[PDB]
Write an enzyme that holds these catalytic residues in place. Structure first.
Site, PDB file in Angstrom:
ATOM      1  CG  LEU A  54      29.983  33.694  48.251  1.00  0.00           C
ATOM      2  CD1 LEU A  54      28.631  34.160  48.781  1.00  0.00           C
ATOM      3  CD2 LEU A  54      29.989  33.426  46.752  1.00  0.00           C
TER       4      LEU A  54
ATOM      5  CB  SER B 299      31.991  39.297  52.914  1.00  0.00           C
ATOM      6  OG  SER B 299      31.774  40.456  53.705  1.00  0.00           O
TER       7      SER B 299
ATOM      8  CB  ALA C   6      39.111  38.486  51.290  1.00  0.00           C
TER       9      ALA C   6
ATOM     10  CG  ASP D 212      39.518  33.539  51.078  1.00  0.00           C
ATOM     11  OD1 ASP D 212      39.138  33.275  52.232  1.00  0.00           O
ATOM     12  OD2 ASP D 212      39.340  32.725  50.158  1.00  0.00           O
TER      13      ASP D 212
END
Ligand SMILES: [Mg+2]
Ligand SMILES: [Mg+2]
Lengths: 308, 312
Positions: B103, B105, B107, B149
């Site tokens: 998801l 986080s 990055a 990312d």
């Protein structure tokens, strides 16, 4: 040869699972079937009229309650008269499911009448006759089911070459969910029509699994057969024929140590199959049962049709 | 909105950067294939003010500069100091992004921090420079990383990888369902690499088929045919299942989402646990979330975000 004209005769024929490649055969591909030790048995006795008894009841020639046996008699009596016969049918192949219930009764009945009335049919003639009976009863049918039931063992499709029988347990788990074999062949084809460049190569890859797998069947590497089965199950999921209850049973079987586990037959419900080490068959069966599947414990069968 | 008071001189600055899910193509990029990522409206926000020393405050507590407790914010300040002095700064970090499942986080905190120091101290960095810098930071902190990312968190919207082509953002809800099952990204990547090793003639064309999905799906995103995007996400999910990265908990959540009317649902990121994602009509968002919730998941209702890094 020794007369046997009045000899009560019993024949049996097995059901089957697919190791790989169900759904792919219509689209040109190679598959690998494995006959199992769940049989339909047919005993034929001389009689003054036609009587057919099975778990459904006792009838005469009745195309409604006894469609396959009745069609077999109807067709074979055109060759050699059958004045009378008492046929008793029993099956251990679970009521409905790509396992080959109608092919097994068809082949066992042909076998039994072949013997009792001396048609002298070879196995190839029996398989072709059976195929013909399924066409008559269903309207249209693939010869594969009657061929695998006739000859048994492990059979590549459609070249029909016999491969060595694996020494493994087979657990069949039934989700108890009904699905239409026609509706799912119908949806595979449709998804195929909407994204041809995507779906055609997928059938190609299922075909590839059988070619790789043939070689693993020969060397008895069941652990790799299982890994491929798992890949094939994922390709079946991508084709749209998996449901939650099938995954539920599949994941329980895998967690309990199965080499692999997959849908067997059309999907959308029905049964999955797990291939296991013989000493792990019970534990996989208990895990699938634990998860709510209706479990049958079996194993590959070397012989197809046989005089018992 | 705001207060009647207008401050004199230097203000608090605030930047935020989003997390992302994969519409298609996780796992296939490292094999030369295309993916499509979609940044979503779950952001990490970094607020920044001038200070004589360094203070970093986040969900974990308040520290000075600290490479164990704040490894990314602390690496950002360290790298950026090499071009412009940062005598001191007070940084507060908060986030709506759940951990892992690619998801994004790490990055998001990296890019938000870069963006916040960019604004406060007048570094004049463009988006491309910010993403490149964030890519360099991830490398520094965890040893090796792809630029994806940090690129996607910098730019936002829907982005094709690795071609970095912006696509029209779809008008859909996104439901993320977390199974709460822990698995490790590098182990799954390894296990996938091993399977391709054992059957290269089987597995390489499956990668190639996941790349085709992204190719077809790019056009469906362009034309807003969400129903077919879902149907293709359903196919990509079976291909991830073929690659061995699905588990029972993920399937439970995925079928529930599809029964409740999602256009489609699939693993997002590494699999083996972690999260799945469902794409839904805005109407059916609550329906789908309740059903994934009903089936056992920790659910987060979001939607796509049009840009990435923003000055708030
Ligand atoms: Mg019958
Ligand atoms: Mg940090």
């Amino acid at each position: 040869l020794v007369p046997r004209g009045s000899h009560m005769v019993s024949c049996s024929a097995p059901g089957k699972i697919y190791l790989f490649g169900e759904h792919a055969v219509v689209y040109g591909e190679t598959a690998i079937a494995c006959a199992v030790e769940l049989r339909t048995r047919v005993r034929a006795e001389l009689n003054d009229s036609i009587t057919i008894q099975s778990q459904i009841g006792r009838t005469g020639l009745d195309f409604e309650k006894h469609p396959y046996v009745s069609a077999v008699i109807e067709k074979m009596r055109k060759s050699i008269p059958i004045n009378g016969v008492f046929l008793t049918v029993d099956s251990d192949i679970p009521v409905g499911s790509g396992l080959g219930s109608s092919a097994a009764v068809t082949i066992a009945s042909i076998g039994a009448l072949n013997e009792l009335f001396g048609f002298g049919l070879s196995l190839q003639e029996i398989a072709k006759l059976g195929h013909e009976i399924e066409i008559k009863v269903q309207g249209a049918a693939s010869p594969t089911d009657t061929y695998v039931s006739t000859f048994g063992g492990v059979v590549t499709i459609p070249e029909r070459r016999k491969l060595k029988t694996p020494d493994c347990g087979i657990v069949i788990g039934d989700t108890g969910v009904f699905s239409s074999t026609k509706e799912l062949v119908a949806n595979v084809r449709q998804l195929r029509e909407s994204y041809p460049d995507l779906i055609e190569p997928l059938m190609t890859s299922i075909g590839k699994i059988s070619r790789i797998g043939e070689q693993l069947v020969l060397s008895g590497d069941y652990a790799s057969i299982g890994r491929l089965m798992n890949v094939n199950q994922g390709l079946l999921d991508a084709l749209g024929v998996n449901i939650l209850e099938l995954s539920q049973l599949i994941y329980s079987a895998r967690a309990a140590g199965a080499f692999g586990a997959k849908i067997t037959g059309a999907g959308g419900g029905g049964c999955m199959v797990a291939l296991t080490a013989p000493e792990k068959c019970n534990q996989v069966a208990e895990a699938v049962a634990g998860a709510g599947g209706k479990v049958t414990i079996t194993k590959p069968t070397e012989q197809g049709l046989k005089v018992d």
